[PDB]
Ligand binder design. Structure first.
Ligand SMILES: Nc1ncnc2c1ncn2[C@@H]1O[C@H](CSCC[C@H](N)C(=O)O)[C@@H](O)[C@H]1O
Length: 185
C-alpha cells in the first residue's frame, strides 16, 4: 500500500475498549497485545491519524504489553491509555459515542469528524456473540456494523477494523478499504 499526499490529522477519537481481560486466555491476550500495537503502527503511517485511546487499560494486557514491548509503549504518539472506562473518559460526549459491533442492526456509512468510535478490545473468535452489542445497549449508546455485506457474504480482528476505519478516512470508499485489508484474493 502506498500513501499519497499531505498528512492531515483527523479530529476523530478511536477507542479500544479494553474491559474484557477476564474473558480471554493467555494466547488471546498475547494476540490482542499484537493487535493493539498494529493499531498504533497503522495510525502512525495513516494519511489522517486519529487520537487512539485504550480505555480500562490494565491487567494482563498492560503487563503483556510492557513485557513484549519493554517500555516502548510509553514512547508511542497520538496514543492515550487510561484505566478510565470510555463512559468515564467521554461522559460529556456520550451522545457522540458509537460502539462498532458486527451484531448491530445499524450500518456505518461514514465516519463523522465529531464522533468517537469504539472497538471491542477482545480476541474471542466471536464465541461471545452479542457481547459488545449488549454492553453498548445497556449504556444507551449507539452501535453500528461495518458495511461489509454484500462484498463479504464477517467478524474482523481489532486491528483489521481499525485499519479499515483509517483507510476509509483516506479513500472515503469502503470497497477500497476492504480490498486492501481483506482482499478476496
Ligand atoms: N463487522 C463488524 N462490524 C463492526 N465492528 C466489528 C466487526 N467485526 C469486528 N468488529 C469489531 O472488532 C471487535 C473485536 S471482534 C468481536 C468479538 C465479540 N464477540 C463482540 O461482541 O464484539 C468488536 O468488538 C468490534 O468492535
Amino acid at each position: 500500500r502506498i500513501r499519497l499526499g499531505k498528512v492531515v490529522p483527523s479530529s476523530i477519537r478511536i477507542v479500544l475498549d479494553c474491559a474484557f481481560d477476564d474473558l480471554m486466555n493467555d494466547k488471546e491476550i498475547n494476540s490482542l497485545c499484537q493487535q493493539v500495537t498494529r493499531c498504533h503502527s497503522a495510525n502512525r503511517t495513516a494519511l489522517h491519524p486519529v487520537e487512539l485511546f485504550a480505555t480500562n487499560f490494565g491487567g494482563r494486557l498492560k503487563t503483556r504489553q510492557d513485557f513484549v514491548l519493554k517500555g516502548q509503549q510509553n514512547n508511542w504518539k497520538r496514543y492515550n491509555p487510561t484505566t478510565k472506562s470510555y463512559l468515564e473518559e467521554f461522559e460529556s460526549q456520550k451522545e457522540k459515542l458509537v460502539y462498532l459491533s458486527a451484531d448491530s442492526d445499524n450500518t456505518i456509512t461514514e465516519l463523522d469528524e465529531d464522533k468517537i468510535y469504539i472497538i471491542g478490545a477482545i480476541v474471542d473468535k466471536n464465541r461471545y456473540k452479542n457481547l459488545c452489542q449488549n454492553k453498548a445497549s445497556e449504556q444507551g449508546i449507539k452501535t453500528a456494523k461495518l458495511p461489509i455485506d454484500e462484498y463479504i457474504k464477517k467478524i474482523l480482528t481489532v486491528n483489521q477494523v481499525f485499519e479499515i476505519l483509517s483507510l476509509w478516512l483516506e479513500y472515503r470508499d469502503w470497497e477500497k478499504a476492504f480490498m486492501e485489508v481483506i482482499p478476496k484474493r
